[PDB]
Design an enzyme around this catalytic site. Structure first.
Site, mmCIF file in Angstrom:
data_model
loop_
_atom_site.group_PDB
_atom_site.id
_atom_site.type_symbol
_atom_site.label_atom_id
_atom_site.label_comp_id
_atom_site.label_asym_id
_atom_site.label_seq_id
_atom_site.Cartn_x
_atom_site.Cartn_y
_atom_site.Cartn_z
ATOM 1 C CG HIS A 1 -1.414 -1.340 1.689
ATOM 2 N ND1 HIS A 1 -2.059 -2.301 0.909
ATOM 3 C CD2 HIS A 1 -1.260 -1.896 2.915
ATOM 4 C CE1 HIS A 1 -2.269 -3.387 1.628
ATOM 5 N NE2 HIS A 1 -1.785 -3.166 2.863
ATOM 6 C CG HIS B 1 2.039 5.693 5.870
ATOM 7 N ND1 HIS B 1 1.566 5.561 7.156
ATOM 8 C CD2 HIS B 1 1.121 6.428 5.207
ATOM 9 C CE1 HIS B 1 0.410 6.186 7.272
ATOM 10 N NE2 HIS B 1 0.124 6.743 6.096
ATOM 11 C CG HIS C 1 -0.677 8.673 1.391
ATOM 12 N ND1 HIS C 1 -1.534 7.584 1.352
ATOM 13 C CD2 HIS C 1 -0.402 8.882 2.702
ATOM 14 C CE1 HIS C 1 -1.766 7.155 2.584
ATOM 15 N NE2 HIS C 1 -1.078 7.934 3.437
ATOM 16 C CG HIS D 1 -0.081 10.350 6.575
ATOM 17 N ND1 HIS D 1 -0.995 9.619 5.864
ATOM 18 C CD2 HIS D 1 -0.297 11.639 6.244
ATOM 19 C CE1 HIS D 1 -1.747 10.429 5.140
ATOM 20 N NE2 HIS D 1 -1.337 11.670 5.358
ATOM 21 C CB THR E 1 -6.507 8.173 4.788
ATOM 22 O OG1 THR E 1 -5.114 7.860 4.795
ATOM 23 C CG2 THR E 1 -6.783 9.468 5.512
ATOM 24 C CB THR E 2 -5.522 2.512 4.695
ATOM 25 O OG1 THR E 2 -5.271 2.156 6.053
ATOM 26 C CG2 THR E 2 -4.383 3.362 4.168
HETATM 27 ZN ZN LIG Z 1 -1.429 7.682 5.424
HETATM 28 ZN ZN LIG Z 2 -3.788 -5.138 2.600
HETATM 29 ZN ZN LIG Z 3 -1.966 -4.485 4.437
#
Ligand SMILES: [Zn+2]
Ligand SMILES: [Zn+2]
Ligand SMILES: [Zn+2]
Ligand SMILES: *[C@@H]1O[C@H](CO)[C@@H](O[C@@H]2O[C@H](CO)[C@@H](O)[C@H](O)[C@H]2NC(C)=O)[C@H](O)[C@H]1NC(C)=O
Ligand SMILES: [Zn+2]
Ligand SMILES: [Zn+2]
Ligand SMILES: [Zn+2]
Length: 276
Positions: free
Chosen positions: A65, A94, A96, A119, A208-209
């Site tokens: 991701h 992480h 984006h 983030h 936001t995931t």
């Molecule tokens: Zn994030």
């Molecule tokens: Zn996943």
């Molecule tokens: Zn995952």
């Protein structure tokens, strides 16, 4: 089995496939609208500080991701009150980004997108023992959003990647899910010094995931830090996981949520902080 690019599992479907809580009404990200926010002069300069006794190593990973930096415990802290007392502990950072340079951020500022948004994710340690205690409990998480702006004629020590220590060279085609990897420590305090930490938006929202938990005290800084085109592109080199229709990792950002959907039962407010 959620994705960004697979239309059957993609963001439009999160509110259905993970009702708790991707269907709530305190979602992120939002458009941070300067002119529709309440200045709150009691919000203080954000401080990031390290436990210098910590000596454990820092890692990075492709999780399918994002490119996610996992920090050792008891290492990195946030203070929102000027007190250095380990109230918030940084877990992980992480990123984006977009497929092209003209998008990639989750938050917008007055409608403007940015190429890359990081983030820094921390847990409320004053209340909770460990990251996994926090992640699912109310008021458990505090996240910092950092905007990045693409710049051309610049020295390397003035870009963010200096603070990242260039991710110890780890970014390339080879880096594949879920392969972890050791890197030199990110100098997060230096990272913060490259923007203005008295100037940010502040509001209650979510991850936001999926599963989009409504337990994030959000802080998004107003001034972006600087990256080169060379720098951004190293991100697009990472492969996505099996769940994605696209091959190269990118557009890993969620569409814009409303501050207050019309079905909300208690409105929330966007706040903003300013220096001295
Ligand atoms: Zn994030
Ligand atoms: Zn996943
Ligand atoms: Zn995952
Ligand atoms: C700062 O880091 C040190 C060292 O990593 C932490 O102390 C260690 O961890 C726990 C104490 O809670 C024990 O298992 C050990 O006795 C300590 N070992 C070492 C290596 O000294 C310390 O607690 C951290 N401080 C904060 C505020 O997180
Ligand atoms: Zn629906
Ligand atoms: Zn204005
Ligand atoms: Zn160039």
């Amino acid at each position: 089995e959620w994705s960004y690019t697979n239309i059957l599992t993609g963001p439009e479907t999160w509110h259905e496939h993970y009702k708790n809580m991707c269907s709530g009404y305190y979602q992120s990200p939002i458009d941070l609208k300067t002119d529709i926010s309440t200045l709150d002069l009691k919000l203080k300069t954000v401080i990031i500080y390290r436990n210098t006794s910590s000596t454990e190593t820092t890692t990075i990973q492709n999780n399918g991701h994002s490119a996610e930096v996992k920090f050792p415990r008891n290492t990195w802290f946030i203070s929102f009150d000027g007190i250095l007392d380990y109230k918030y502990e940084i877990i992980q950072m992480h990123f984006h980004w977009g497929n092209t340079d003209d998008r990639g951020s989750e938050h917008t500022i007055d409608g403007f997108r940015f190429p890359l948004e990081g983030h820094i994710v921390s847990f409320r340690r004053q209340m909770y023992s460990s990251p996994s205690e926090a992640i699912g409990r109310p008021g458990g998480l505090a996240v910092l959003g950092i905007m990045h702006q693409i710049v051309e004629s610049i020295k390397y020590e003035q870009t963010a990647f200096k603070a990242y220590n260039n991710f110890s060279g780890v970014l390339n085609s080879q880096f594949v899910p879920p392969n972890n990897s050791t890197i030199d420590d990110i100098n997060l305090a230096l990272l913060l010094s490259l923007l203005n930490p008295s100037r940010y938006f502040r509001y209650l929202g979510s991850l936001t995931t999926p599963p989009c938990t409504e337990n994030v005290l959000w802080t998004v800084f107003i001034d972006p830090v600087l990256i080169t085109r060379e720098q951004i592109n190293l991100f697009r080199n990472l492969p996505y996981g099996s769940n994605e229709k696209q091959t190269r990792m990118g557009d890993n950002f969620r569409p814009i949520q409303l501050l207050n959907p019309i079905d909300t039962l208690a409105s929330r407010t966007l706040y903003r902080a300013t220096a001295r």
